[PDB]
PDB file of C-alpha atoms and ligand atoms in Angstrom:
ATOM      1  CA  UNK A 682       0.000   0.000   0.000  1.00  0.00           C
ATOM      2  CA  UNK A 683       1.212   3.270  -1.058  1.00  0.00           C
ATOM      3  CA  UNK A 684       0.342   7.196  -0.727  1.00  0.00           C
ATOM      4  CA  UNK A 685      -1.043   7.580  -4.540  1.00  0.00           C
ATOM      5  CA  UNK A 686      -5.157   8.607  -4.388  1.00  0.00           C
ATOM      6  CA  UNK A 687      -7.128   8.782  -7.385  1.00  0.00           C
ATOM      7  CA  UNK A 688      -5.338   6.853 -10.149  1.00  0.00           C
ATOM      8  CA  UNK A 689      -6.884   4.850 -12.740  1.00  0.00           C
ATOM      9  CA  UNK A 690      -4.885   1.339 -12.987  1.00  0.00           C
ATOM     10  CA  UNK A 691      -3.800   0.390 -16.782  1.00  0.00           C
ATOM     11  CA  UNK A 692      -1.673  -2.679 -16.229  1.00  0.00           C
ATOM     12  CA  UNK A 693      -0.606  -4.889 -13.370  1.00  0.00           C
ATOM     13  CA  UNK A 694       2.063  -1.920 -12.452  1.00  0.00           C
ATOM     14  CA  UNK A 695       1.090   0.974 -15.029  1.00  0.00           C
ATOM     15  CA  UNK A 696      -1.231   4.043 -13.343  1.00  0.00           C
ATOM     16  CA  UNK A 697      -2.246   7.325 -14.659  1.00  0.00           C
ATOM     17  CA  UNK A 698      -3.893  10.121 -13.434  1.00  0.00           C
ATOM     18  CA  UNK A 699      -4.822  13.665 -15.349  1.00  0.00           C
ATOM     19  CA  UNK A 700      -2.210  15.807 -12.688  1.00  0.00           C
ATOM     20  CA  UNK A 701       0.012  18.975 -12.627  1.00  0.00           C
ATOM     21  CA  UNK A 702       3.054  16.249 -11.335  1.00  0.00           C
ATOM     22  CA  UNK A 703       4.268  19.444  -9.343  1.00  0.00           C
ATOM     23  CA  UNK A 704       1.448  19.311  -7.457  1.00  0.00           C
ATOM     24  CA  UNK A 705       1.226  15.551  -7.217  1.00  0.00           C
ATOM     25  CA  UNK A 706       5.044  15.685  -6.090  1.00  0.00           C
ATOM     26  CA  UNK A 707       4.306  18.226  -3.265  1.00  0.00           C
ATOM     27  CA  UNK A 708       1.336  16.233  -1.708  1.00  0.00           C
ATOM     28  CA  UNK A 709       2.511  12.989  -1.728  1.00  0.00           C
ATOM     29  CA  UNK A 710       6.617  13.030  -1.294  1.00  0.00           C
ATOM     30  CA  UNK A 711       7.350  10.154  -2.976  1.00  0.00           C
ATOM     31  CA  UNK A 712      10.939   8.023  -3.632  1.00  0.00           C
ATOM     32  CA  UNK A 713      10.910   8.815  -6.689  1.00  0.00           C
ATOM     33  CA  UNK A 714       9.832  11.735  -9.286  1.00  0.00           C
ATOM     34  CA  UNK A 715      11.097  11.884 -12.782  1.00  0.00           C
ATOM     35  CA  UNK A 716      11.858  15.011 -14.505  1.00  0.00           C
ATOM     36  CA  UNK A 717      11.850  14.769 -18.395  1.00  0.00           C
ATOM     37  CA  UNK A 718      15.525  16.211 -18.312  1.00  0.00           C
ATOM     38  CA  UNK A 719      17.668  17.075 -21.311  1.00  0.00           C
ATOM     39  CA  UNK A 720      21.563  16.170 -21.292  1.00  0.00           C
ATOM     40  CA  UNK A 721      22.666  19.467 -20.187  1.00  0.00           C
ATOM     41  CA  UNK A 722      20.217  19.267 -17.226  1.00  0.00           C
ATOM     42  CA  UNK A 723      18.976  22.296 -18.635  1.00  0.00           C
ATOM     43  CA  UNK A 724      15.280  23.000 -16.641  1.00  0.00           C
ATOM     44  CA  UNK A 725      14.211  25.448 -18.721  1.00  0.00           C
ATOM     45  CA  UNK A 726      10.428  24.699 -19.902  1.00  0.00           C
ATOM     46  CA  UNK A 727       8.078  21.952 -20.014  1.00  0.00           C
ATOM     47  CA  UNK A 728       7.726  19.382 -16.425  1.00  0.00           C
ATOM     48  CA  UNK A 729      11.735  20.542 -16.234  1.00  0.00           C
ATOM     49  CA  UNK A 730      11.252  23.883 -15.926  1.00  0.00           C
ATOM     50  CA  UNK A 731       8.285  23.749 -13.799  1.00  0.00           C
ATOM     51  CA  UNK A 732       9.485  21.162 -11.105  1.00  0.00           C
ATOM     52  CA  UNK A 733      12.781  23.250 -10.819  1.00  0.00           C
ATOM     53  CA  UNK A 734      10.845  26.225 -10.025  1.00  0.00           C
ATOM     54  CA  UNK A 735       9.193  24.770  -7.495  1.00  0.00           C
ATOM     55  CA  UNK A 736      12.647  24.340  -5.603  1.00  0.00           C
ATOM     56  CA  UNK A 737      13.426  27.732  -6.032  1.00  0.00           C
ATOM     57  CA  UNK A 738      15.883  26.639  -8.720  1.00  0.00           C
ATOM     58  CA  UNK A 739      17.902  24.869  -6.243  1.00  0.00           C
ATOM     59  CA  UNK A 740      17.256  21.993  -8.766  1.00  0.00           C
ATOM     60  CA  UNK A 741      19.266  23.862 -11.421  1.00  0.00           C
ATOM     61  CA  UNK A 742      22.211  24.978  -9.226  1.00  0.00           C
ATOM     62  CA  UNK A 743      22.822  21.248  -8.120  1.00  0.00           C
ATOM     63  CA  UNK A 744      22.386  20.241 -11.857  1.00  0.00           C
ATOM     64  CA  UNK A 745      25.143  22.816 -12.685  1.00  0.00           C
ATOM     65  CA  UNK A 746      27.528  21.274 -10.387  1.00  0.00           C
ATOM     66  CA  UNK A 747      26.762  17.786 -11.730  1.00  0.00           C
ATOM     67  CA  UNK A 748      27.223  18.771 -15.407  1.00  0.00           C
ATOM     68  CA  UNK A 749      30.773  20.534 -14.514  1.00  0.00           C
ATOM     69  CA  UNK A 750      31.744  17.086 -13.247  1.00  0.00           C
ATOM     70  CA  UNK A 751      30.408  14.882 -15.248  1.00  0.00           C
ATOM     71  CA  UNK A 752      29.723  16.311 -18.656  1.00  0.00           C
ATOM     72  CA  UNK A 753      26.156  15.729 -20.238  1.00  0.00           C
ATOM     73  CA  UNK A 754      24.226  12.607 -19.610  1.00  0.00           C
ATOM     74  CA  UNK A 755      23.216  10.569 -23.218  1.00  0.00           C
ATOM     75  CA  UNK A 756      19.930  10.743 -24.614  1.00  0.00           C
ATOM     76  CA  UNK A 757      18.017   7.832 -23.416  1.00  0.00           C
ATOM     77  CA  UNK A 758      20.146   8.249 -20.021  1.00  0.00           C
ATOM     78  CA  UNK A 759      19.764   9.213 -16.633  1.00  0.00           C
ATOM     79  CA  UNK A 760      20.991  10.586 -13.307  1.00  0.00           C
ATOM     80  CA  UNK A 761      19.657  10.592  -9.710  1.00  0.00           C
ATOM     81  CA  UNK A 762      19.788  13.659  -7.861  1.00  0.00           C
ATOM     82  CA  UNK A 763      18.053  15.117  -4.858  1.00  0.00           C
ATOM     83  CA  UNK A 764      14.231  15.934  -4.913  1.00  0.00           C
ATOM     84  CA  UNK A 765      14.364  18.827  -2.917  1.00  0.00           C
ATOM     85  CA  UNK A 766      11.310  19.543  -1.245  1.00  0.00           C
ATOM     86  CA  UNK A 767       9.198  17.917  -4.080  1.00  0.00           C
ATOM     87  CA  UNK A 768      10.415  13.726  -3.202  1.00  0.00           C
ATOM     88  CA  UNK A 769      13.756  11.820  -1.546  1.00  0.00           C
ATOM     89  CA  UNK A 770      15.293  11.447  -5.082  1.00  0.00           C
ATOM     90  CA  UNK A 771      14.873  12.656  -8.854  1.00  0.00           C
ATOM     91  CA  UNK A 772      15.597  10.668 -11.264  1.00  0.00           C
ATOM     92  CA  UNK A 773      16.609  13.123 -14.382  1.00  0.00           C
ATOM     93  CA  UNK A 774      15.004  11.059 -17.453  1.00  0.00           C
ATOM     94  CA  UNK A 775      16.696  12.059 -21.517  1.00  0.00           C
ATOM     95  CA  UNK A 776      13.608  11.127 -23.043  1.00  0.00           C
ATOM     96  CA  UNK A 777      14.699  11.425 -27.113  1.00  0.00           C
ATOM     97  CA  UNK A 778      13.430  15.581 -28.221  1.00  0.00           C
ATOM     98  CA  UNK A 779      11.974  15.317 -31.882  1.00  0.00           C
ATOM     99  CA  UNK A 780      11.928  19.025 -32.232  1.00  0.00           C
ATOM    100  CA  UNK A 781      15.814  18.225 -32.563  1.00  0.00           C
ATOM    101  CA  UNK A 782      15.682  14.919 -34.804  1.00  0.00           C
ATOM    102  CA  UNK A 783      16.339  12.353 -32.161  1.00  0.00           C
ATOM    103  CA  UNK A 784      15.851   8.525 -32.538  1.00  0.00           C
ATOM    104  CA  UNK A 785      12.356   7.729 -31.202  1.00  0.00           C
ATOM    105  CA  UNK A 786      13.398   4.136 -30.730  1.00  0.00           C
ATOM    106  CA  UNK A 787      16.042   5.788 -27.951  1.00  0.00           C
ATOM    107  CA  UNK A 788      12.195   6.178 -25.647  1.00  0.00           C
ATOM    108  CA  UNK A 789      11.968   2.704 -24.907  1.00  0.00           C
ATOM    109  CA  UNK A 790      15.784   2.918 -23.499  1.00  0.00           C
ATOM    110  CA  UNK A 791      14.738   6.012 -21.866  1.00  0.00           C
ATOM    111  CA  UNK A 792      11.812   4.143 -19.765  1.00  0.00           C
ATOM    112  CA  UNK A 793      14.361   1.563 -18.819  1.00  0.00           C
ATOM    113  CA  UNK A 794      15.581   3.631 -16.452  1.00  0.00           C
ATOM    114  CA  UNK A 795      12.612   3.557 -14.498  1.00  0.00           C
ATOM    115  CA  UNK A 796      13.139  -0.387 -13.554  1.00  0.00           C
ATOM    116  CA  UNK A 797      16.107   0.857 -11.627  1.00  0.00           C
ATOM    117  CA  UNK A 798      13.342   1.964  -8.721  1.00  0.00           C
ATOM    118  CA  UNK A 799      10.042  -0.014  -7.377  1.00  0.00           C
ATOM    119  CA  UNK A 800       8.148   2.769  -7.005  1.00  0.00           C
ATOM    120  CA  UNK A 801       8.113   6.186  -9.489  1.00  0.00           C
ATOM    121  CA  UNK A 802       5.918   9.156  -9.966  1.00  0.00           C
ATOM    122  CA  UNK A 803       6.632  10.367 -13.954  1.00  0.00           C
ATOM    123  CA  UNK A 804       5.446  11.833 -17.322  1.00  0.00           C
ATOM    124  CA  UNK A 805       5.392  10.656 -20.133  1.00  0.00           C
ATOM    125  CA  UNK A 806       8.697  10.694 -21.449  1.00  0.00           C
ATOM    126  CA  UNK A 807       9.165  13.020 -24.509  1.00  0.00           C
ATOM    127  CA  UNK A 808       5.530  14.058 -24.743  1.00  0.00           C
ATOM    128  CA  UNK A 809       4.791  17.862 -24.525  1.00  0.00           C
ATOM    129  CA  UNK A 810       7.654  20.380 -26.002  1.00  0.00           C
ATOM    130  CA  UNK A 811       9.639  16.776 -26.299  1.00  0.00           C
ATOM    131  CA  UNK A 812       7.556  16.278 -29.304  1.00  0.00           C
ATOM    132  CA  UNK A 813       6.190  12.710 -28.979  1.00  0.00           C
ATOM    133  CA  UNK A 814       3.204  11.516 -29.847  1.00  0.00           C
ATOM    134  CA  UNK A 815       1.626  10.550 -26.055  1.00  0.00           C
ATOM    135  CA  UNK A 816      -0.300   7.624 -26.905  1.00  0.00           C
ATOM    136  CA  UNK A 817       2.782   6.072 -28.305  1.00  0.00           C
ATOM    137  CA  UNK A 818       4.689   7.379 -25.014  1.00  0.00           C
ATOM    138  CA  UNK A 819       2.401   5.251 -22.778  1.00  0.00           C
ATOM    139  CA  UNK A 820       2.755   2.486 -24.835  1.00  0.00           C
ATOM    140  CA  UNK A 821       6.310   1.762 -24.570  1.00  0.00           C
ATOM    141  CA  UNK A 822       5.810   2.773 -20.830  1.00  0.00           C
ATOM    142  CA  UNK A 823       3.412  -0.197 -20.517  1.00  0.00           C
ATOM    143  CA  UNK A 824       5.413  -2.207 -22.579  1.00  0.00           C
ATOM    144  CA  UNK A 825       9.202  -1.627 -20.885  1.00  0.00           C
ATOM    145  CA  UNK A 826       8.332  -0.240 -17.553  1.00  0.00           C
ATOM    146  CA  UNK A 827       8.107  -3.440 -14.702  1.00  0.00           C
ATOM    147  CA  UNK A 828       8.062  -1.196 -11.173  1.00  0.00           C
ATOM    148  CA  UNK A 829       5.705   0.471 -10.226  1.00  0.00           C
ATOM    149  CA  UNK A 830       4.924   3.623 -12.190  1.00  0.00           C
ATOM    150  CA  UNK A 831       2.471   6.474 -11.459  1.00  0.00           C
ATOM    151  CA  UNK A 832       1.651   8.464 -14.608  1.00  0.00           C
ATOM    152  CA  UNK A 833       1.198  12.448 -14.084  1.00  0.00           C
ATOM    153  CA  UNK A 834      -0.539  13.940 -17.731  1.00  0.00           C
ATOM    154  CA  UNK A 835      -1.063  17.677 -17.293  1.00  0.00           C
ATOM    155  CA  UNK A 836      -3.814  18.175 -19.141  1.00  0.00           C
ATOM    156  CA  UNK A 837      -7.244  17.021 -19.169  1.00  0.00           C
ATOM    157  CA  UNK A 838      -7.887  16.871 -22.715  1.00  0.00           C
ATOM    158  CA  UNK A 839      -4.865  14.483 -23.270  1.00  0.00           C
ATOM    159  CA  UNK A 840      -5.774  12.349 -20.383  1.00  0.00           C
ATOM    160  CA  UNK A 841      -9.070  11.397 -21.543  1.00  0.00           C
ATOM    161  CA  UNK A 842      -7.712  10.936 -24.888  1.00  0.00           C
ATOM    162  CA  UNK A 843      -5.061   8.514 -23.361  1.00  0.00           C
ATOM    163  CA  UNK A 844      -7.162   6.519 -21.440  1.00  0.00           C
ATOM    164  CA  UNK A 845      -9.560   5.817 -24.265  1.00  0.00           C
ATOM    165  CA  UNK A 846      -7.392   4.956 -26.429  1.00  0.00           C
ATOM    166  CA  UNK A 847      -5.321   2.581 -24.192  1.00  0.00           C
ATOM    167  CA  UNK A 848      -5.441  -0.810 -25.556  1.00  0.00           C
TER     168      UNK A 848
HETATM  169  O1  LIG B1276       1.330  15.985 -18.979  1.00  0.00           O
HETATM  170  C1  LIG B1276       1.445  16.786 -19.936  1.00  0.00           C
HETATM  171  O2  LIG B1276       0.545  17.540 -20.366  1.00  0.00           O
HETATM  172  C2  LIG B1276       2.814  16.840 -20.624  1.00  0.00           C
HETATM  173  C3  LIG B1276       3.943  17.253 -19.649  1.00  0.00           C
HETATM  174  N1  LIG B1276       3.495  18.479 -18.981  1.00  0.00           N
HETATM  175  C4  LIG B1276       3.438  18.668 -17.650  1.00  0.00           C
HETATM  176  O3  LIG B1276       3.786  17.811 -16.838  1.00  0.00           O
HETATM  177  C5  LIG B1276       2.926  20.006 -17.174  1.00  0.00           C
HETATM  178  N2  LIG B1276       2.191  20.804 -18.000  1.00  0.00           N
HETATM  179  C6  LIG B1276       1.733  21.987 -17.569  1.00  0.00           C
HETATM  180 CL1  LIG B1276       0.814  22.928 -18.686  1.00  0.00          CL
HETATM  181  N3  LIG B1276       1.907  22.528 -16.358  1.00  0.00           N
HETATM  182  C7  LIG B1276       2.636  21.728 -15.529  1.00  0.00           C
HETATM  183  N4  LIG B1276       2.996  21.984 -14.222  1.00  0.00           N
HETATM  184  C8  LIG B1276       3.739  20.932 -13.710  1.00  0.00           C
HETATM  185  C9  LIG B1276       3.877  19.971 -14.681  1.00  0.00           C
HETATM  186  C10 LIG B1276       3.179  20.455 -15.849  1.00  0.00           C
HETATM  187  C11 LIG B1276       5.306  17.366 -20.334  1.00  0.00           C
HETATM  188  C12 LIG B1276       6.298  16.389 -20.093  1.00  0.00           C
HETATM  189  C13 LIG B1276       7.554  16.481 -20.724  1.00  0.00           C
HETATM  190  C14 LIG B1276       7.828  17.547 -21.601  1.00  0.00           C
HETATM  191  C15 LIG B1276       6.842  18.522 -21.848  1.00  0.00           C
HETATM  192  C16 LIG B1276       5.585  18.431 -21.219  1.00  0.00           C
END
């Protein structure tokens, strides 16, 4: 038994929920929350921008220091950092951007990352200013994700549109 409330179950380990997954993050302090990072670590828009701003941008100054370290991460990779006041860990997600002509087949490697941790709270990896078609998104989540992941989709409109078209 776990903290989530009000998710609609799509698989054995696959939820979702129509959710600002700032909000979500604030209310129930999970593990885990993904950010839909880019390899620079870059928070500058989309759930990147927005979950950074809720830490007063302490996300992006502890991002900074990573980067100087340890270069970029690879699209399709990932890092765990702090989650601030928002959860215990983030786990900084390179979901492949097609507004820059990245290899879609790179998403399911992307969501692979999330089998690394039992429990997650996440978006749909490059959906949004990613570029990504979102029904597609949840389907290689369902299909490569085997923890337990709780799905955050901003808006209403997609939601509905995600859930009835879920096969
Ligand atoms: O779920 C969606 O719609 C898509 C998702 N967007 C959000 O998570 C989101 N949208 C709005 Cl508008 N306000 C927000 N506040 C806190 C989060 C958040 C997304 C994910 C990756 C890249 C780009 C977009």
């Amino acid at each position: 038994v776990n903290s989530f409330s009000g998710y609609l179950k799509l698989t054995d380990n696959v939820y979702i929920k129509n959710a600002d997954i700032v909000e979500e993050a604030k209310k129930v302090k999970p593990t885990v929350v993904v950010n839909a990072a880019n390899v620079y670590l870059k928070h500058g828009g989309g759930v990147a921008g927005a979950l950074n701003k809720a830490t007063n941008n302490a996300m992006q100054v502890e991002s900074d220091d990573y980067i100087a370290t340890n270069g970029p991460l690879k699209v399709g990779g990932s890092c765990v950092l702090s989650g601030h006041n928002l959860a215990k860990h983030c786990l900084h997600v390179v979901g492949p951007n097609v507004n820059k002509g990245e290899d879609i087949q790179l998403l399911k490697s992307a969501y692979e990352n999330f089998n690394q941790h039992e429990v997650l709270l996440a978006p749909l990896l490059s959906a949004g200013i990613f570029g990504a078609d979102p029904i597609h998104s949840l389907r290689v989540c369902v299909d490569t994700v085997r923890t337990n992941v709780y799905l955050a989709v901003f808006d209403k409109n997609l939601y509905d549109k995600l859930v009835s078209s879920f096969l």
